[PDB]
Structure 1
Amino acid sequence: VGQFANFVDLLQYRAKLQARKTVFSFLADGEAESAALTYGELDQKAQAIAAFLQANQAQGQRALLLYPPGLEFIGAFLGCLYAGVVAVPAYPPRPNKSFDRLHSIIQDAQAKFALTTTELKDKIADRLEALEGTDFHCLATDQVELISGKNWQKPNISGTDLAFLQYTSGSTGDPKGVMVSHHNLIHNSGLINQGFQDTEASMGVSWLPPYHDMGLIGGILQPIYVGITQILMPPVAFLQRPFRWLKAINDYRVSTSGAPNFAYDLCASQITPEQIRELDLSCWRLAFSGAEPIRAVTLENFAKTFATAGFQKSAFYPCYGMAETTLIVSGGNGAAQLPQEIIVSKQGIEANQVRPAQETTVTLVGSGEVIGDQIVKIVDPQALTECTVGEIGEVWVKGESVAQGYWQKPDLTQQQFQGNVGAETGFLRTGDLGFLQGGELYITGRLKDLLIIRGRNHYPQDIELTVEVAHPALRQGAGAAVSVDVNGEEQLVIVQEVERKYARKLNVAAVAQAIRGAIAAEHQLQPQAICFIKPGSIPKTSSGKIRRHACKAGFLDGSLAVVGEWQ
């Protein structure tokens, strides 16, 4: 299984050894099973979608995948890998909504094809002719006869061949196209396994969106790499009823499931004690947390709320990675059983220094140990010099899981993927600030979002966290801290969402004073402005990640749903 150069060779091996073993079982409601596929059935569907793609002239071309969460997406993705089509996964179009995001990906990828369901094709095909022209082909893959796979021409695949374009969320700018090779998929899959240590006997459940990151290389490809059964449900099922995630873990004895930090909080806040009494989570040995700052308070609250249900905090597996690194770089608590946490000086962090406080203290959770034969270095963003111990700098990654570059973006590719430091070359600039401590990599935040006000460095998420809890009328997770230029000097602007219940009876001055008071105590900062926005109006990615730069653009252009303003 570890001699496989690509996932096409690998699934074909699994379709022989475990043909009748169930690979994916989809619960459309997060409760009852709706559909399933065996390794043999997944292989056959893949050869058939492949043959449909090759006859449709898609080989060597880029194809958008537009599918609802389900097994059709999975089959279309593996069909593209079998066919030699560069797949471009994306969130599907939704009703009463624009296709701007989708057209922008089509223009960037120079895609000639959209792969979708019969239902969506009948609703979007003419809109795609309007936007992309007649030479663009919206194809449906859900009604391909399985006998078509007899006409599949196996491409001569090498690991250096490009498999798919993984587009970034667009939190810091425009989505960029990550060129993920076949070797990138195989190398990182092994890296996830050197850390997760899963076996053919491991069970998995995943509500994560299948389009990108943890949902695709981990929720779809890792089950196939390890030869295990994965239970899958739509993210909306978990979001509406978080108990469905933990009930599935209990029901199928799931060993390995995980999600971003916010999901652990929602499970803790929205699961009743009667529901906790229906749970047995002793089966959960790896509970991963990635794609978002891991907060120490969230780890403790989950461990405390669910210890009666058998959850152990030793199961928490902190992990870090990005699309430019395929998926994972660091993970695990090392020789420790519990996620390593350091208590350091707040003002020190604002000064790129990690030191004890002698000064308010901050608690930082490690994002894991560098997994495998990859090399992580902490470098100064401007001087391109390697930071010493206790210094905070840009995380730099050199390894075989580093993507080939950004699609049709040559200048940015040389800048971010040709990182030179001292006598070293070939490093990827992650754009993430952090530091090395205890063999563990800690992450402080994103460079492009870092706020520099009054000669001090301020992390936007640290300020957003203070504002959300300042008044009950503020919606948590729906706020942005941005720097605007006032007379040549940088100042702080807060764009925060008000709660739907508090929108009509909102005391702008009272809540603004609660906000100014909290930011001054914790950050010694005075907001130039506080813009209160309507519930659900914050510029967000398709994932839900806040676009802070677009909040500053909208404040400066007046495009926000303003229900209140302070200046």
Structure 2
Amino acid sequence: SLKKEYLQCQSLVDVVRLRALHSPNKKSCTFLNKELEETMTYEQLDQHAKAIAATLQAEGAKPGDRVLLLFAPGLPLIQAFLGCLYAGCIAVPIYPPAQEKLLDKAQRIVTNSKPVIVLMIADHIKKFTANPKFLKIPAIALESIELNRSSSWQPTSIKSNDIAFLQYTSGSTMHPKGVMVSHHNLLDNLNKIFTSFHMNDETIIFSWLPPHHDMGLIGCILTPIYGGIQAIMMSPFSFLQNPLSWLKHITKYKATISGSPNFAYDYCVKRIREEKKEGLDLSSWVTAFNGAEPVREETMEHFYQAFKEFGFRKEAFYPCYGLAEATLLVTGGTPGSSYKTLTLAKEQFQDHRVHFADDNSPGSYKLVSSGNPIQEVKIIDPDTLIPCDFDQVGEIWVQSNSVAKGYWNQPEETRHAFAGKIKDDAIYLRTGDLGFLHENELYVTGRIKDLIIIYGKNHYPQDIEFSLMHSPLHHVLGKCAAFVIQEEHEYKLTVMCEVKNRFMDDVAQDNLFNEIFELVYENHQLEVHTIVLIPLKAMPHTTSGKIRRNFCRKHLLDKTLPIVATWQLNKI
């Protein structure tokens, strides 16, 4: 980031070490649970990392070995992650395998990455193991690690191109893809983030984002640690239970940067009653980033109208685009500036070119700019491999020192994504994303592959239905079905449930809708957009999820079936 001595460091390990010498008592990370606060300084973070690394070394872990990190959000996850890096080990973070699908995912990650050790908290060695082992991997409770081991740490010779950690992406549920992020990849992107976000020493980051997804890890934890900036955090569970707490904490801690995928702004609008806004002051919040999924004008306008009386300014909104394969940040605008939009015509014909329309012409729709290329971005036709003109839709191809090394132990998939070559032309990351450049700003339009097809091959509908049927929620329900609907230019994950009691009162309905949203988010890392409640026995008898699902999809579309209530995330 800023000071030259830090720019010169060759890994995040040395950045943390040096910060701990220059400013041992500077607050780094704060984690919040309810009204409880725990903070660690740079001196502490460095000492914990050394202690953990010395333990890994004492237990036979070698540079390049993978160490699985099984943690809920919190300071222990962050200590363990740095501790892995200090040992030259490849960190492999995973969500605690609390339910069936999360456990299946963990097993597939273990099989792929073949870690030598797993770290987790003492409580979890009891919950997830029978020398304790988790899925045959020797396990170690982080609490067993004492600070008197710190001085035993032996520095390794970390090279730029060495892999620092694996970040597993969503999708590919059947063969999870572990993106190999090198030490050089990581520092390159951290610098791009610090710079592009105009961070400085007033900056304070707040995050509730999953630390097991790139944005919440690389953006909201590793960047602040790298840049000497406070990270103030809570768990996604805390956010979903009480989204107001996000805005309360931003208020209390005068956070300047905080953000999320687009849905979370709608979730705030939907969940926070006018009277509960009393006490907010969001004037400090100058960069409200919006990335990881399609960015919606309507969402941001709703949020702006809902919070403007409490100091929130629409200019704070900062659309951005990226993916794990490029470490994180690929495009973004200028902080404090108004993001741009374009209005496309209903009819886009077949030329792959963008067809524009007057600012509210019939059937027109708006796309939000994801900002300027920060990594090099080319729009390339995915079939012919010929570059697209501006205002012509093609695949988003990326190149820079932030582009990752491949997928762990998946050589064919790695060639499929990281070896893009332009017809008659460098090597590019092929994102699978479609979009276009207009006046040097990137407009993301969709995915090459049909999202309904993707949901299907990942077994999302069947697995979401399983979750509902196996949660305590099933006690007030009959049968259920989950599916994705494409509905003018957007995709909406839709859940339909029979309810035993068709007179379910408005409060119970609201609670039920929220419980459903939380369940799917936790079990599947997906966001439900629409929930429909219908009477018992309203779905025909069948032993087939597919038949049941097709019936619900078809009769939602008909507008025939009896409906008890509907919930729409993005509607007021």
TM over 0.5: yes
Alignment correspondent of 2:108? 104
Equivalent of residue 22 in structure 1, options 18, 27, 31: 27
Gap change, CA 1:241 and 1:2, over 3 Å in 2: same
CA distance in 1, matches of 2:84, 2:498: 44
Gap change, CA 1:535 and 1:35, over 3 Å in 2: closer
- Could you tell me which runs of 5 or more consecutive residues in structure 2 were left unpaired when the two chains were aligned: 1-5, 454-480, 505-514, 530-541, 556-572
Q: C-alpha deviations, 1:339-363, integer Å up to 9, x for none?
A: 1000012321775321223872110
2:322 touches 2:329 (CA, 8 Å); kept in 1?
yes
CA distance in 1, matches of 2:174, 2:41: 40
The alpha-carbon deviation at position 127 of structure 1 amounts to 13
CA distance in 1, matches of 2:110, 2:366: 43
The alpha-carbon deviation at position 425 of structure 1 amounts to 2.7
Gap change, CA 1:498 and 1:559, over 3 Å in 2: closer
Q: C-alpha deviations, 1:120-176, integer Å up to 9, x for none?
A: 0122122985x844xx21121222010101110101111100000101112686420
Q: How does 1:106-145 map to 2 (within 5 A)?
A: 106-126=110-130, 129=133, 132-133=135-136, 136-145=137-146
CA distance in 2, matches of 1:155, 1:128: 28
Amino acid corresponding to residue 119 of structure 1 in structure 2 = D
Q: How does 1:329-348 map to 2 (within 5 A)?
A: 329-333=330-334, 337-348=337-348
2:101 touches 2:523 (CA, 8 Å); kept in 1?
no
SS, match of residue 427 in structure 2 = strand
2:494 touches 2:528 (CA, 8 Å); kept in 1?
no
The alpha-carbon deviation at position 80 of structure 1 amounts to 0.3
CA distance in 1, matches of 2:522, 2:273: 29
SS, match of residue 129 in structure 2 = helix
Gap change, CA 1:194 and 1:538, over 3 Å in 2: closer
- The answer to whether 1:72 aligns with 2:70 is no
Alignment correspondent of 1:149? 150
1:497 touches 1:538 (CA, 8 Å); kept in 2?
no
The alpha-carbon deviation at position 276 of structure 1 amounts to 2.2
Alignment correspondent of 1:34? 37
CA distance in 1, matches of 2:310, 2:103: 44
Q: How does 1:219-230 map to 2 (within 5 A)?
A: 219-230=220-231
CA distance in 2, matches of 1:69, 1:349: 47
CA distance in 1, matches of 2:232, 2:352: 43
SS, match of residue 150 in structure 1 = helix
CA distance in 2, matches of 1:246, 1:349: 43
Alignment correspondent of 1:214? 215
Gap change, CA 1:499 and 1:333, over 3 Å in 2: farther
Gap change, CA 1:380 and 1:17, over 3 Å in 2: same
Amino acid corresponding to residue 346 of structure 2 in structure 1 = K
Gap change, CA 1:142 and 1:494, over 3 Å in 2: closer
Amino acid corresponding to residue 55 of structure 1 in structure 2 = A
The alpha-carbon deviation at position 229 of structure 1 amounts to 1.4
SS, match of residue 325 in structure 2 = coil
Alignment correspondent of 1:388? 389
The alpha-carbon deviation at position 18 of structure 1 amounts to 1.8
- The answer to whether 1:497 aligns with 2:495 is yes
SS, match of residue 180 in structure 1 = strand
- What count of residue pairs does the alignment treat as equivalent? 491
Q: How does 1:138-177 map to 2 (within 5 A)?
A: 138-170=139-171, 174-177=175-178
Q: C-alpha deviations, 1:406-458, integer Å up to 9, x for none?
A: 11111221221110013443100000111101211111112122579xxxxxx
1:380 touches 1:393 (CA, 8 Å); kept in 2?
yes
CA distance in 1, matches of 2:246, 2:264: 10
CA distance in 1, matches of 2:303, 2:493: 29
Alignment correspondent of 1:400? 401
Amino acid corresponding to residue 19 of structure 2 in structure 1 = R
- When structure 1 is superposed on structure 2, of 189-198 and 357-366 the one drifting more is 357-366
1:478 touches 1:538 (CA, 8 Å); kept in 2?
no
Amino acid corresponding to residue 339 of structure 1 in structure 2 = Y
CA distance in 2, matches of 1:441, 1:502: 48
- When structure 1 is superposed on structure 2, of 275-284 and 101-110 the one drifting more is 275-284
Amino acid corresponding to residue 6 of structure 1 in structure 2 = S
CA distance in 2, matches of 1:261, 1:280: 21
Alignment correspondent of 2:560? none
2:315 touches 2:339 (CA, 8 Å); kept in 1?
yes
Amino acid corresponding to residue 56 of structure 2 in structure 1 = L
The alpha-carbon deviation at position 275 of structure 1 amounts to 2.7
Alignment correspondent of 2:367? 364
Equivalent of residue 87 in structure 1, options 70, 87, 91: 91
CA distance in 2, matches of 1:75, 1:494: 37
Alignment correspondent of 1:354? 354
The alpha-carbon deviation at position 546 of structure 1 amounts to 7.8
SS, match of residue 318 in structure 1 = strand
TM-score w.r.t. length of structure 2: 0.80
Gap change, CA 1:451 and 1:132, over 3 Å in 2: closer
RMSD of the TM alignment (CA)? Answer: 3.1
1:217 touches 1:327 (CA, 8 Å); kept in 2?
yes
- The answer to whether 1:47 aligns with 2:50 is yes
- Could you tell me which runs of 5 or more consecutive residues in structure 1 were left unpaired when the two chains were aligned: 453-476, 483-492, 507-533, 548-555
- When structure 1 is superposed on structure 2, of 318-327 and 493-502 the one drifting more is 493-502
Alignment correspondent of 1:446? 447
2:207 touches 2:234 (CA, 8 Å); kept in 1?
yes
Q: C-alpha deviations, 1:212-265, integer Å up to 9, x for none?
A: 211100121011121011111011111111110001111111111111111111
Alignment correspondent of 1:531? none
CA distance in 2, matches of 1:95, 1:128: 20
